[PDB]
Amino acid sequence: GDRINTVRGPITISEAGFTLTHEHICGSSAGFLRAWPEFFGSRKALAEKAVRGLRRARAAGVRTIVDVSTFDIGRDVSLLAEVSRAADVHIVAATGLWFDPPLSMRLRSVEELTQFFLREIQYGIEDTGIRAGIIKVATTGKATPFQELVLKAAARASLATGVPVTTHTAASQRDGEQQAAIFESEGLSPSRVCIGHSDDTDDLSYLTALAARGYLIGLDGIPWSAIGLEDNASASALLGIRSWQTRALLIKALIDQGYMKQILVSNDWTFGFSSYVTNIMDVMDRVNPDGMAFIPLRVIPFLREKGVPQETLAGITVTNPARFLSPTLRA
């Protein structure tokens, strides 16, 4: 509750500083990176790409990033540790399950999944001794039975460890509502959960409803936009057609209603991406050359130029993250 686990070890709350709460070094699949490294050029190249990108964010002031890649996202902790050490940026690793779990998981029970999540947070990931500092879960519209189980196990592990929960939603379908439901049914405090991909909807009504209950709202895909790239059906399907300004304004909307303490902002960027069409990255890097630095460089000043006081900006990027990430046990 005093220290936060990173792939380099524990750090104190003050050490975290400017923190990006939903990012990825690589978006892939379990075992993929070890089996076919050439799909990304080479492991060495994915790594140099990541270090450069991370150095750039650090220059703009980023000190910590939370890589929310789960086992099924193809998380490679060794990879995380190596770029973390090289770029000198702290990286928080995750446990949980995304939406592409293999058979060996789909068949597990809630109790077995609970153990698995606990193993990762308390014992370490694989045989590295590296501990996860966050649990990631997801739904794609109406939850599946399996998904239901996932949410429950995430809640149990969190209750037992004090580590927070972060989710992937289909904002459009108001997933957040169903997720809150399950978590509360487990006794988990909304203050330990972040409902992500929220900037993906314009429904301010949905957002404040959640904000109002004590949840954290993740506005994490700021730079995601296929505007001008309407040519590409695939890019458009992923990126959406709302501009980044539209997304950034939600941030101001929430502040305005008085929810500055429940806002978490991120880019949801990546340096590699195998779980999608081939060459989607190329397209992405074209739309956002700034990568992870996009927030500090572009969103921050923009929000400033619109009436938001710097100090408020500092609380959303430093203060909220710290409070969220510190392991906290229920009274």
Added chain:
Amino acid sequence: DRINTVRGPITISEAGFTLTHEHICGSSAGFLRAWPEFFGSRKALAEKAVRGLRRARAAGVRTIVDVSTFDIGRDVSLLAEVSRAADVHIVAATGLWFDPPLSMRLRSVEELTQFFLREIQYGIEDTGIRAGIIKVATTGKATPFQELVLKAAARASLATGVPVTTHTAASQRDGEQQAAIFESEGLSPSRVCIGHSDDTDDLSYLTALAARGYLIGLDGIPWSAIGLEDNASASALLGIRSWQTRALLIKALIDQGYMKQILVSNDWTFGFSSYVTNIMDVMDRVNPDGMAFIPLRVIPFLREKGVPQETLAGITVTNPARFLSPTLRA
């Protein structure tokens, strides 16, 4: 002339008694490294594997083909380690089964071709261990992805000479569509083994494929839920046909003159996480002999039913060697 094993190349003559469809562990990609305790421990699994392989060895088995693909959680390093301890040759595989992740499902036929060749020519992961066979699958009518897979499989095979082995839903006659696709890519049937064939009682479906030149895989002989019907999961997986019935299919094809087209295995495993928890315990109760089941029980049974030893020797020694030998097209 030389077959690729997890310990290196071997000459055809060293293969000897070969079991063509087995598994050291039946899991998922990354699973064993992430949650070894699910199996007791990695060390425990390994030790179990070494034991049962030494027993099979005792009985005469010299080589085993582990048909575990990437998505089956194949761990080449585990394989090498137990091959070394037991002193049994193990042949590894490339290909895809029916649980591919997004990263795989989204690739093109050309991409898939590359991955399979990589595993066969360059090696598995970073180990340098080369695959000696390609495993594919269908579970009834092929999906479009599955179609691509079968195509890339056929292509990798043509370029390398390495045989192809498949999983099928025998009862749905999957073999027929697989052949159609394979033939369309130019692949010769003699390079292909249509697996799980013992899962059907339809002799006509089997003789037709044999006639065309395919190898028939009669590989789940010991799989039977007979007396375990109180267990639905178990029964769903093992079936309720007895081991004798499966074995007889072997005699049935010999009798039709296709002994040269027959391949026999157990489809056994020492670890199994892609199923209900505790299935292994059920399985080990059903077949204490493990992989030695073939030699200790099927051979003697067949001999007793009138099959000449020598014929038996052709099936377990000669057929595999021919199948396994990397064969290029004319």
